[PDB]
Ligand binder design. Structure first.
Ligand code: K
Ligand code: K
Ligand code: K
Ligand code: MG
Ligand code: MG
Ligand code: MG
Ligand code: MG
Ligand code: MG
Ligand code: MG
Ligand code: MG
Ligand code: MG
Ligand code: MG
Ligand code: ZN
Lengths: 56, 51, 196, 67
RNA sequence: GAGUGUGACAGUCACUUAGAUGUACGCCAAAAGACCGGAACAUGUCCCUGAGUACCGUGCGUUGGAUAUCGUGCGUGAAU
RNA sequence: CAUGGAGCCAAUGAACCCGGGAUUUCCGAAUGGGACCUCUCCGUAGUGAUCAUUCAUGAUCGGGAACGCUCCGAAUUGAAACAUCUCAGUAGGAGCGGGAAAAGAAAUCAAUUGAGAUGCCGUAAGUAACGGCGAGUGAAACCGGCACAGUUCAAACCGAA
């Protein structure tokens, strides 16, 4: 069975749900974490310095 | 017949009622300057990122 | 001489293995090992040390004994490219001293309080013990106290976490003035961490 | 002018304010039911002014500690 | 006579401008009152003045810091 | 936004602006419990966790463009290779935290005899110093300015004053 279009017919599920906290469809249904805002992992909002460039 | 909870169906309902044309009177009022909006879609396309 | 009894406590703890404090140490370390990470105690073990460090027998002043492991920065060997100078980590102790680690763990256990100071109270082959003095800035007794009501200011919150205690300033290279403090005062971060 | 002003609401009694609030709720029910059939209202601004009068009555009640 | 608007280029059409006015809550704030109190000297087999601290040994990091940077891991460890 | 129809409001002073209030669904620090369920379960109607106090009460939590402090910490790159070095305490990480933060009243700097808290700027100076003494890295004091500010404990003596 080809790794291309044939295996893409099994895409009848999800790995990420809608996030309560931020509204992004980034809540991992297995790890119970939002990969966008960090909901379900931290009480704070997920932010990294590498999300932008070094400001210089 | 997928099974939605109350909130998932509410978000689907909002997506459905957003998929309407701009009213004709709005087009008249704006002098043909507002004739569309970015939430138009078709059900058989790239699906909703809602549910 | 007419010396206060605090002087006698100080003398007993000057060379503890040569005084009665050695037997107290043998009996106390069993109890202290039985305890956890951060233990509150009614009175300081060394009253003179606590009093010279700012302890007072009043409401809003808390003394806690903290347990910290020995040795340096328990470090993982990198699993990617390093240049043989950054590959080795076994001999790399940290830049954070054990006393300041104890102070910060005490601060973590007591979110509403501020660390005042701490002192050494014991150690064995696996642990060191420090007693940390903490102040309640929102207690009216502390608010009235004019020798302590500075701790109610907005810049005094998170003292131990920003290196503002005596141990923290020792760790920042600001325990002395003059030569050797070119890259330490007014802050480590102010000179690109080249001091320390 | 409007259905009833702030001075009118403050002049009434507690029972009078409650009665007028109930009547305004009834009028809003009737007007919204008429629009349920799709048909245009007989008075398009009447619905909005009824709603704002209801809000004004509720605010006067809350100020007067009735609700 | 900064400028912008006004059916084409505006000191004098409009808003402005220059210059004066006013302003609730606030903020600073001088006179004048209430309060703990301050500063010198003489005398000295008198008392007190911060400890696992300062220092040192050894390892490592860091530093321009070089046998002479700072840190901190282990060990050792005072004086009054 | 956004002069279309039809109405509504406004001289009982609206619109608008300034100040002060009210309302303020659910999720969210989210905090009665549970969330592939932004809802759901018990309803005893909800002080979730960690703490201070006499146990009336109180504190902390999340957010904020950058700045600030503490700690952890690469490699590309340069050296025309490369390992010390450099890149660089950079990038990135963790914690704390305010309108600023940190520092701060010498167990200092000087030099033959002086000055007199700290910070920031100028200069010293690419100097001293380090360095396959290669490439490179790299001060401080003195001095001139901005702004100026000094103090509180522990102890001796008294002993709840
Ligand atoms: K013109
Ligand atoms: K090259
Ligand atoms: K190469
Ligand atoms: Mg593949
Ligand atoms: Mg940056
Ligand atoms: Mg812990
Ligand atoms: Mg400060
Ligand atoms: Mg003019
Ligand atoms: Mg915060
Ligand atoms: Mg090269
Ligand atoms: Mg200080
Ligand atoms: Mg460097
Ligand atoms: Zn999210």
């Amino acid at each position: 069975m080809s790794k291309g279009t044939s295996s893409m017919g099994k895409r009848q599920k999800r790995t990420h749900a809608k996030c309560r906290r931020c509204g992004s469809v980034s809540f991992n249904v297995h790890t119970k974490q939002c990969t966008s805002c960090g909901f379900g992992k931290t009480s704070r909002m997920r932010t990294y310095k590498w999300q932008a460039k070094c400001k210089y | 017949m997928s099974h939605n909870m109350k909130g998932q169906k509410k978000r689907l309902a909002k997506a459905h009622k957003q998929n309407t044309r701009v009213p004709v009177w709005v087009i008249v009022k704006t002098n043909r300057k507002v004739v569309s909006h970015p939430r138009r879609r078709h059900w058989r396309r790239r699906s909703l990122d809602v549910k | 001489m007419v010396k206060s009894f605090y002087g006698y406590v100080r003398d007993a703890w000057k060379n503890p293995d040569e005084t009665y404090v050695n037997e107290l140490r043998w009996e106390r370390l069993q109890v202290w090992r039985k305890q956890g990470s951060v233990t509150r105690i009614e009175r300081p073990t060394r009253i003179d040390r606590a009093r010279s460090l700012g302890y007072k027998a009043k409401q809003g002043i808390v003394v806690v004994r903290v347990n910290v492991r020995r040795g340096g920065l328990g470090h993982v060997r990198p699993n990617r490219g390093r240049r043989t100078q950054k590959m080795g980590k076994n001999k790399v102790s940290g830049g954070m001293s054990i006393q300041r680690i104890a102070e910060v763990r005490a601060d973590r256990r007591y979110p509403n309080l501020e660390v005042l100071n701490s002192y050494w109270v014991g150690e064995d082959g696996k642990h060191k013990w420090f007693e940390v003095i903490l102040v309640d800035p929102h207690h009216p007794v502390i608010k009235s106290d004019k020798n302590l009501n500075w701790v109610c200011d907005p810049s005094s919150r998170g003292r131990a976490t920003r290196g503002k205690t005596s141990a923290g300033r020792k760790g920042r290279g600001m325990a002395t003035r003059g030569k050797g403090t070119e890259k330490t005062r007014p802050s480590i971060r102010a000179y690109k961490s080249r001091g320390k | 002018m409007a259905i009833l002003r702030t001075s009118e609401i403050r002049t009434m009694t507690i029972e009078e304010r409650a009665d007028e609030l109930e009547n305004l709720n009834n009028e809003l029910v009737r007007e919204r039911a008429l629009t349920s059939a799709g048909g245009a209202p007989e008075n398009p601004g009447r619905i909005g002014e009824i709603r704002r009068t209801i809000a004004r009555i509720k605010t006067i009640q809350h100020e007067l500690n009735e609700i």
